[PDB]
Amino acid sequence: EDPEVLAKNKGCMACHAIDTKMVGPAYKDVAAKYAGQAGAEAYLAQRIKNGSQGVWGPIPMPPNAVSDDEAQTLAKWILSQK
Numbered sequence: 259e260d261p262e263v264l265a266k267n268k269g270c271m272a273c274h275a276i277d278t279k280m281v282g283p284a285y286k287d288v289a290a291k292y293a294g295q296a297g298a299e300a301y302l303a304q305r306i307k308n309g310s311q312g313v314w315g316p317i318p319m320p321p322n323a324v325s326d327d328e329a330q331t332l333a334k335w336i337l338s339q340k
């Protein structure tokens with residue numbers, strides 16, 4: 259289904275926020291810091307399927323069971339949030 263739909267079925271909208279700061283960096287904000295990358299949604303998918311720290315803060319994102327294609331839409335979904 260749509261990318262956002264995935265954010266709810268996996269729980270991505272639980273620690274993140276299209277703009278408000280919660281457990282992780284806002285979604286749109288994430289694109290503001292990585293903006294300029296030649297494909298940050300692809301690597302974002304590799305870091306979204308395994309999660310990790312040294313990314314935004316000392317709180318490594320818990321790895322999710324999102325297939326590679328689902329984590330790819332999850333990456334472009336964050337940079338496309340509102």
Ligand code: HEM
Pocket residue numbers: 265268269270271272273274281282283302303305306309310311312313314315316317318319320322324332333336
């Ligand atoms: C499957 C749903 C989720 C998606 C699509 C998603 C996506 C992302 C992306 C693209 C990053 C970059 C991390 C990196 O580059 O390694 C990230 C970071 C982060 N996510 Fe998520 N996330 C999801 C669920 C969660 C959940 C459930 C939590 C809270 C338990 C969470 C907490 C964080 C934190 C804290 C960061 C910042 C990186 C750090 O501090 O280590 N995420 N997430």
